[PDB]
Give the backbone structure.
Amino acid sequence: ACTAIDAVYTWVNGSDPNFIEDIRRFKNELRYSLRSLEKHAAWIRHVYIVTNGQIPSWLDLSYERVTVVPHEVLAPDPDQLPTFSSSAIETFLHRIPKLSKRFLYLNDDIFLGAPLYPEDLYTEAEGVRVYQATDIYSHSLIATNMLLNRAYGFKARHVLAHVGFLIDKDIVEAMQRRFHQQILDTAHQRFRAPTDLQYAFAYYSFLMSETKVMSVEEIFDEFDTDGSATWSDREVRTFLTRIYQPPLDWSAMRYFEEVVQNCTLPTITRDLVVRCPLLAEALAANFAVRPKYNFHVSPKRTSHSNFMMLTSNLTEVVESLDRLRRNPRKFNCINDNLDANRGEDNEMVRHLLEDFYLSFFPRRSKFELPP
Amino acid sequence: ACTAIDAVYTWVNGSDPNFIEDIRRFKNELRYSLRSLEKHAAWIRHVYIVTNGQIPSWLDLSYERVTVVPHEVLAPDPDQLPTFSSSAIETFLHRIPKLSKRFLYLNDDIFLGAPLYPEDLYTEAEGVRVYQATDIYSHSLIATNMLLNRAYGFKARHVLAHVGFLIDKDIVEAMQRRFHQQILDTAHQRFRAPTDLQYAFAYYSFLMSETKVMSVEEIFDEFDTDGSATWSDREVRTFLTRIYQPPLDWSAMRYFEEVVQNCTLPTITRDLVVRCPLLAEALAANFAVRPKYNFHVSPKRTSHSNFMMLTSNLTEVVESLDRLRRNPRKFNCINDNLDANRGEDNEMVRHLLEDFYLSFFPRRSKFELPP
Ligand SMILES: [Ca+2]
Ligand SMILES: [Ca+2]
């Protein structure tokens, strides 16, 4: 337990009258997913749930590891807060007061076997493991991809893979200060509309393409190994080897001494290499395009993250739930995509899924009050 | 700083009369390599040096981070201790009293740029990064490879790559209790003889091939997710999916119930699956060959570990020392292989190398007393 994590959760409930009244104005998942944290990741040290005031019935409060914070305290400009979309709620997840610097996102339907360690998400050498992989979701995909395609170059950017995302508070604040038009746009919306900015992809493509700029006075402060303001011949040879690569030659030596002698080896200082052109330009052309935040593409080896959608064909349900059992990987994500016309098959489906979730996680975790 | 490391060093000195007297009876490297620890790895929290009683002249003692321990206190059977080989000294490196569980080996000529983090060596999910890559050294290579080829299978085993090796005390004690013939053989030797067992390769091939055995009572204690001694139909289906893979079929269901019914689904317990043959054999044939220690082959991306031998051709010296400067990688290892006939070129070589080692590490570190 080197660093705190403090994962978050959402849990919208669409069964009580006070939610469907506000909808009219305009599957017990988390119980078995917060239960997975007690088994396979016992280091997260706090759990938040962001709701609209409504608590779950089975939360044992005063556990000092689980709290609920509503949208009344989070959202700026308290005029948008009657909100019923995920992506609007995602835009104020970093305004939780005693939040640690980094945190797991994992939303509601993320249960996890195959125990989780903090080095699976954030190391210190590397440190953000970016897990690469139609009606309403595709349009927001195209809009976010085009918005990140206006700036930041072009390249190919891959979508993510349904893991619990690890999110830094400072990087997302610099994200929201970069796209202040679209953050307020998606914030001031009621439902899921096709001009949205999805938070995870616009985070993990923002972080992958922030390029820092280092000034010439900072390449003098580093890149000599010395005490103060000395640039001697050892540092000169270190400087010349990082430019003219294949061998190093006498031509580069007399080129460098010709450049220093034209400044009208006599004690190369900081003020000379800041002042003199055609060397500071030739120095900053090599070392100024360093990336801003530490990132790490995953080598697709350990957490292959079984997605495995839950359609209403009971055959495909039973090979899907058995194929979640043949491979007990790190993250698993069962989203519904359920029919509403078949009220007879989608009762046996919800009873069949209960056989799956009790097959792995049958103990009453300490988050749940005794019935 | 999650865990302690406490690296070790050797530093044999072949210049004083009291060493050459004992040799007759039968390059300032570490100063610039212990100096690299103050710059690029400030978490190792103790440094040991194992000698034969002789201290360096420039060690500032009472630093409470650097100590010297001689061979008198380490070696069992105090009859072997007049020793003048590396590999004999390597066989009692884990008898240092206040040693942590894991430790860096790095011997004497290992200086390191490009800062080192504990996740570069030992994580918790993985945790031993095994860095794969003629007169006297080749024979010990063939002997150690054949000794590890007698047991442990056959396969291909690769040599290591001159990094600071991370070594566990318990794994090396189980190594020395496996090869008690060769440990005492190489311990009771005076010099480097061609029947040696090299410590790093016989460690990192021992650790890669210890296979554990799990009893059938332990595959009942795990592999049900339950409280105590219950093996119900959810666990049965989890059990059957991990054997008959492609789909799961009704034939496997009636096969399993036929196996349980022939034990002369009626409450499958622990005593039944321990007692009944042709199921416990069929259960342990799948889950008993799990490896003993966590290991991790390195993907050869970050620490490519410039070796770059130091022969006496001054041209090859200057492209070697410049090519150490073009690539500032994680570990670097300059071993001598120096001629002794040319006393005139091998003075300019040692002065030229001093230009290299002061080009990166010029500050007097806190390990060194002021001259
Ligand atoms: Ca300098
Ligand atoms: Ca059970």
